[PDB]
Design a protein around this ligand. Structure first.
Ligand SMILES: *[C@@H]1O[C@H](CO)[C@@H](O)[C@H](O)[C@H]1NC(C)=O
Ligand SMILES: *[C@@H]1O[C@H](CO)[C@@H](O)[C@H](O)[C@H]1NC(C)=O
Ligand SMILES: *[C@@H]1O[C@H](CO)[C@@H](O)[C@H](O)[C@H]1NC(C)=O
Ligand SMILES: *[C@@H]1O[C@H](CO)[C@@H](O)[C@H](O)[C@H]1NC(C)=O
Ligand SMILES: *[C@@H]1O[C@H](CO)[C@@H](O)[C@H](O)[C@H]1NC(C)=O
Ligand SMILES: *[C@@H]1O[C@H](CO)[C@@H](O)[C@H](O)[C@H]1NC(C)=O
Ligand SMILES: N[C@@H](CCC(=O)O)C(=O)O
Ligand SMILES: [Cl-]
Lengths: 343, 189
């Protein structure tokens, strides 16, 4: 049993130190966006295997004064020289510079901070600059990720540079220091986002990616833009609305899952006995299967027309039609759910 | 992928999911800047690549210059009719992000589990292909049995299924939870 209830405000991040960093930003007068950015910068250090300024993000943001939700799209984008047949194996699409898409992270932070920031840009970086220099004990998640990838990490000395102690990956509890990223964070704090996309970091970024066999160019970085989505996806759930990003993210899938299940009117009773509980969980799995059948039509809506697909995936009536094909006593083969690769 | 959830004192909120894709992304680290580059290109489908036996590639998610690849991420915010936030939730982990986010919601909103239980409760996943239901190792085994008698094939997750960070409004304020599977804890005041 481990509850955390707060009267005024809260941050839930995947490392305690980053939650605290977000919390302190709030306490110093920051917006929810300030806190999120400060915390994200920290998670990029403490769970560096999972996210960071070399990646991309989406933020769903709700303003309680205007009661409006918005989405900020800062996901990476295929470089200008990319093409459909550029990879011939999975290993090619996964390792090395050619697997790299144009990072959107910092630009996402910028747009969000531009629209909703209260604290100065540099203030958001300060705690993480310190942390990366001081170092920190390796947490549970990062340790398991290090073990999982120990072979690759130990064979690539630029990664072993920071992620190993004496040629072997760091273990939980052992200190991790990230002195180069600390300097880079400092540059970003002082020179702003421009340093990444069109400034002092840019040539080096391009050099590192091309040296590893990639094709990202300076122009790709100069041209990257985070996007504001003023009308994100929503569905009604009883007396509530649920705001989530549409394609290219999986809001449409989530929406369909929940719209299928809402017609069963689940409550506490749904899990009070083994018989009810078993049927409830079967129903969940079948909702998953139907929703995943439709997922294969989704893609970037700037490049593919997903208007009608998403309209179906968020329609309660369409969902009810799928729910009526869920059999209480059996699951079905793949084709029953009508997976679709073309409209 | 990494998910975090935030609610400020004025009731405004942020749900944020961020990613470099696979563990350590492309495995390319800059020796000068220390930046670890994503391998987000792996999230496109390619006519030349087969990821599952019998699964064809998805033309809608083919690589084109300037296009964004499909993502499992879904940072979500649920708000009540009175304009006040009810839930801030999202997840990280794999293809299981979407299903785990749905479960967190179902668990809290419908089964009545408090936010920590909703985060800690065992999860399961099915994504049509592969044709198997993955369950976490401490799932109620009556559920496993109920699934198999209905002809599902179940398999036990070697590690864990997804990672969920959540905040929910309660009478006592804002209850927050981070997922023990990854080792987080929240903070607030
Ligand atoms: C894969 O094959 C195509 C077609 O010949 C080629 O254009 C591309 O460069 C190849 N990619 C790699 C990484 O070898
Ligand atoms: C919320 O909306 C109000 C009214 O438009 C605006 O003045 C305020 O700056 C917004 N809050 C943030 C953090 O952007
Ligand atoms: C900055 O942008 C301009 C045009 O946007 C370009 O000419 C210049 O080379 C860029 N500088 C860097 C370092 O990318
Ligand atoms: C949800 O659906 C669409 C989104 O574009 C819009 O017509 C409607 O206003 C949205 N509802 C809310 C409560 O934001
Ligand atoms: C939307 O759903 C209807 C059934 O309700 C179906 O006839 C139609 O083909 C669907 N549209 C797409 C693009 O799948
Ligand atoms: C998938 O699993 C179901 C579950 O019993 C089974 O009916 C079906 O034959 C399996 N294979 C396919 C291709 O659906
Ligand atoms: N980075 C994996 C996703 O976006 O789903
Ligand atoms: Cl996470």
């Amino acid at each position: 049993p481990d509850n955390h209830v707060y009267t005024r405000a809260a941050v839930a991040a995947d490392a305690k130190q980053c939650s605290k960093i977000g919390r302190d930003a709030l306490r110093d007068g920051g917006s929810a966006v300030d806190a999120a950015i400060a915390a994200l910068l920290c998670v990029g250090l403490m769970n560096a295997h999972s996210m960071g300024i070399g990646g991309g993000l989406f933020l769903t943001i709700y303003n309680s004064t205007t009661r409006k939700a918005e989405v900020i799209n800062a996901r990476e984008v295929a470089p200008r020289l990319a093409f459909a047949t550029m990879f011939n194996s999975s290993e090619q699409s996964q390792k090395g510079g050619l697997s790299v898409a144009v990072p959107g992270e910092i630009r996402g932070y910028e747009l969000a901070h531009q629209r909703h920031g209260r604290l100065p840009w540099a203030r958001l970086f300060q705690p993480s600059i310190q942390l990366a220099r001081q170092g920190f004990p390796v947490g549970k998640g990062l340790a398991a990720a290090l073990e999982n990838k120990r072979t690759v990490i130990e064979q690539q000395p630029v990664l072993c540079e920071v992620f190993c102690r004496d040629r072997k990956v760091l273990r939980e509890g052992e200190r991790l220091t990230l002195p180069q990223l600390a300097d880079t964070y400092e540059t970003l704090a002082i020179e702003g986002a421009q340093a990444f996309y069109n400034g002092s970091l840019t040539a080096q970024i391009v050099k590192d990616i091309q040296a590893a066999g990639g094709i990202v160019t300076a122009e790709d970085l100069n041209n990257y833009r985070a996007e504001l989505i003023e009308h994100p996806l929503n569905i009604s759930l009883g007396d509530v609305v649920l705001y989530m990003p549409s394609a290219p993210l999986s809001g449409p899938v989530l929406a369909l899952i929940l719209n299928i299940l809402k017609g069963y009117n689940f409550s506490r009773e749904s899990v009070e006995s083994p018989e009810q509980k078993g049927l409830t969980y079967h129903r969940i799995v079948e909702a998953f299967r139907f929703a995943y059948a439709k997922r294969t039509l989704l893609g970037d809506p700037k490049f593919v027309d997903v208007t009608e697909v998403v309209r179906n995936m968020t329609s309660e009536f369409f969902a009810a039609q799928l729910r009526a094909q869920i059999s209480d006593d059996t699951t079905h083969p793949i084709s029953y759910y009508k997976p679709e690769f073309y409209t | 992928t990494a998910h975090l959830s935030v609610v400020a004192e004025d009731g405004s909120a942020v749900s944020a999911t961020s990613t470099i894709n696979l563990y350590f992304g492309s495995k390319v680290r800059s020796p000068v800047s220390g930046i670890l580059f994503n391998n987000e290109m792996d999230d496109f489908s390619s006519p030349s690549i087969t990821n599952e036996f019998g699964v064809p590639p998805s033309p809608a998610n083919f690589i084109q210059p300037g296009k964004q690849p499909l993502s499992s991420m879904c940072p979500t915010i649920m708000v009540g009719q009175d304009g006040q936030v009810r839930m801030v939730v999202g997840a990280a982990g794999g293809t299981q992000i979407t299903t785990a986010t749905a479960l967190a919601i179902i668990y809290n909103l419908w089964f009545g589990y408090d936010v920590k239980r909703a985060v800690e409760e065992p999860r399961l996943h099915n994504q049509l292909l592969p044709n198997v239901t993955t369950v976490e190792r401490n799932i109620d085994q009556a559920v496993t049995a109920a699934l198999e008698t209905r002809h599902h094939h179940t398999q036990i997750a070697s590690t864990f299924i997804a990672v969920v960070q959540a905040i929910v409004r309660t009478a006592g304020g804002w209850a927050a939870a981070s997922d023990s599977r990854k080792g987080g804890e929240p903070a607030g005041y």
